[PDB]
């Protein structure tokens, strides 16, 4: 929806948004798949009847032998022989329409916001990469750890903080991906990062 709870050193001023409302699960899904799809690296290999050390000679004359009938041992029906239709390496990715890419990211952030978890932040007293600081901030922020958080900030020091913290996941502003988003319970991002987010979709 709209109105989002922005947190600052000056209190909890709740600004407004523009994100849509109608959350279409299927669409959201397609995107997520596309993600878990493009990362799928093809490495599974099975040397077919072709690439097998075995000779090319015929085992029996296939006549007046009393035996079955074959050529070389490279035949699949020769335990050890070439795989029949074994999967060879190949890409699993494609090109999901850009519109959808954004449409999802919108409905995504909009969903967790609509539920009431999109806490925009700014005041980061976490002077450096010292986890203690972060957990001390999150504590006074409303993040007792009972909810997995996606931390989107520009500062690389804030990374350090929740970087090791198990119940949280750091991420770049552009790193906004529909997977990790709909992969956590809470979403909390830097106001400045909410700006670049408004760039892709505002």
């Amino acid at each position: 929806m709209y109105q989002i709870p922005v947190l600052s050193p000056s209190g909890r001023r709740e600004l407004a948004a523009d994100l849509p409302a109608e959350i279409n699960p299927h669409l959201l899904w397609e995107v997520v798949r596309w993600q878990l799809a493009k990362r799928r690296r093809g490495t599974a290999s099975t040397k077919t009847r072709g690439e097998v050390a075995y000779s090319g000679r015929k085992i029996w004359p296939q006549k007046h032998t009393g035996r079955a009938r074959h050529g070389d041992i490279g035949a699949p029906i020769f335990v050890g022989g070439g795989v029949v239709f074994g999967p060879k390496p190949r890409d699993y990715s494609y090109t999901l329409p850009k519109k959808v890419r954004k449409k999802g990211l919108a409905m995504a952030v909009a969903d967790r916001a609509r539920e009431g978890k999109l806490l925009l932040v700014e005041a980061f007293a976490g002077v450096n990469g010292k986890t203690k600081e972060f957990l001390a901030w999150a504590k006074e922020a409303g993040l007792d750890g009972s909810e997995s958080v996606l931390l989107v900030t520009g500062n690389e020091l804030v990374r350090r903080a929740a970087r090791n913290l198990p119940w949280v996941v750091t991420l770049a502003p552009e790193g906004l991906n529909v997977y990790d988003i709909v992969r956590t319970e809470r979403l909390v991002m830097d106001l400045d990062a909410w700006e670049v987010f408004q760039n892709r979709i505002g």
Partner: protein, 146 residues
């Protein structure tokens, strides 16, 4: 919203048919049962039969080739004035190519149906009927030359 329950909205269904099992599609494995069904048939579209294929037709299409290849002639992209009037201002090959119906084409020819709005239509070609609508309200910018 959590990972669980995002799946296809009931209509993806990767229900790939398994042609061999014991029920549904068994021994023969999918529609077969006869012979010449193991490697592959002829084409068959356009091709087999054994006789003089339906390829009995005859090429009237002249200019059906030449050694030097293809001649270089001004390609004329026919554009309808109905879409032309949609946007108003100064319609030139520049505008129609940037967004419209030109696609790095060569020549532009306004014509067709619709009701030409009052504006300068800088085209390379004009239909006799197309020269009427725009002459009832507007100007007729012809092409270049050199």
């Amino acid at each position: 919203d959590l990972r669980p329950n995002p799946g296809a909205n009931k209509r993806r269904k990767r229900v790939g048919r398994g042609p061999g099992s014991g029920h549904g599609k068994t021994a023969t494995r999918g529609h077969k049962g006869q012979k010449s069904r193991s490697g592959g048939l002829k084409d068959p579209r356009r091709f087999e039969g054994g006789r003089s294929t339906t390829l009995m037709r005859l090429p009237k299409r002249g200019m059906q080739g030449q050694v030097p290849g293809e001649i270089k002639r001004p390609r004329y992209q026919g554009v309808n004035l109905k879409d032309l009037a949609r946007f108003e201002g100064e319609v030139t090959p520049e505008l129609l190519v940037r967004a419209g119906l030109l696609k790095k084409g060569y020549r532009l020819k306004i014509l067709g149906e619709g009701e030409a709005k009052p504006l300068k239509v800088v085209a390379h070609a004009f239909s006799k009927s197309a020269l009427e609508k725009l002459k009832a309200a507007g100007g007729e910018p012809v092409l270049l030359e050199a």
